[model samples]
Target: ELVLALYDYQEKSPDEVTMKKGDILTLLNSTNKDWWKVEVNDRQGFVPAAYVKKLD
Candidate 1:
């Protein structure tokens, strides 16, 4: 599924991805549920699942 970042996020690790408001991301994995793996800007990593909402 696709999601949209509602706010900016500063990644705490190389395994995570930073995103700005309105940035579009493709959901890769949600094994952790709250921390989801996503792809954006040609990069892939985790972000707070709560920070994004399902796109339609």
Candidate 2:
């Protein structure tokens, strides 16, 4: 599924990519619950679950 970032986020880990508001991401997995795995700008990483909203 697809989702959108509601705010800009600077990831603390090297594995995650910083996202800006209006950035589009694809929800890859949500098995972790609190940290959702997503794909944005061709990079994949975990983002805060509350920071993103599912795209209709």
TM-score list, all predictions: 0.89, 0.87
Candidate 2 wrong stretches, greater than 4 Å = none
- What are the clashing pairs of model 2? none
| Residue-by-residue lDDT tens digits, candidate 1, 1-56 | 89999999989998999999999999999788789999988989999999999886
25-48, model 2: which lDDT tens digit per residue?
999998877888889888899889
For candidate 2, give the lDDT of residue 13: 96
Q: Report the poorest 10 consecutive residues by lDDT, candidate 2.
A: 14-23
Q: Candidate 1 — which pairs collide?
A: none
The TM-score between candidate 1 and the true structure equals 0.89
Root-mean-square deviation (CA) per prediction: 1.0, 1.1
- C-alpha RMSD of candidate 2: 1.1
